[PDB]
Amino acid sequence: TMFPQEARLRNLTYSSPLYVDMRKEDEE
Amino acid sequence: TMIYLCADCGARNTIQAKEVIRCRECGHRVMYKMRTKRMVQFEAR
Ligand SMILES: [Zn+2]
């Protein structure tokens, strides 16, 4: 995980990933 | 090559040119640089 501001200087962007449950059919 | 120092631990990382930036007995991946010797001319004004 990120620990800013120990980040920043690594010119790192401070985001998190999105996870959306997608439906195609296999119950889950 | 030279020595480097970590942001947290500070232990001597003494790591080699062109490799991977990190530490040894711990974690995190940054590092600053030891101050030179170095008796430096400083006026008191
Ligand atoms: Zn360290």
Side-chain angles (χ1 to χ4, degrees):
Chain A
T1 178
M2 208 68 271
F3 295 84
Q5 309 111 352
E6 292 178 16
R8 301 188 167 185
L9 304 322
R10 287 169 67 102
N11 285 174
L12 199 149
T13 301
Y14 188 69
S15 57
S16 49
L18 271 69
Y19 286 118
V20 183
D21 294 342
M22 309 293 316
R23 293 190 179 183
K24 62 184 173 186
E25 298 160 1
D26 297 3
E27 297 177 9
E28 308 174 0
Chain B
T1 62
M2 268 61 187
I3 306 307
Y4 291 88
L5 300 177
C6 156
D8 300 1
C9 345
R12 185 151 289 171
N13 294 29
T14 173
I15 78 200
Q16 289 195 1
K18 197 277 192 65
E19 193 176 354
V20 174
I21 304 74
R22 50 194 305 188
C23 50
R24 289 288 187 167
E25 295 178 3
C26 30
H28 299 77
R29 294 166 182 101
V30 276
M31 293 178 301
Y32 307 122
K33 184 187 276 189
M34 178 80 196
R35 176 171 288 255
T36 174
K37 317 195 176 193
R38 208 268 170 198
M39 298 162 197
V40 210
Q41 195 54 5
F42 277 98
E43 315 176 3
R45 304 181 190 176

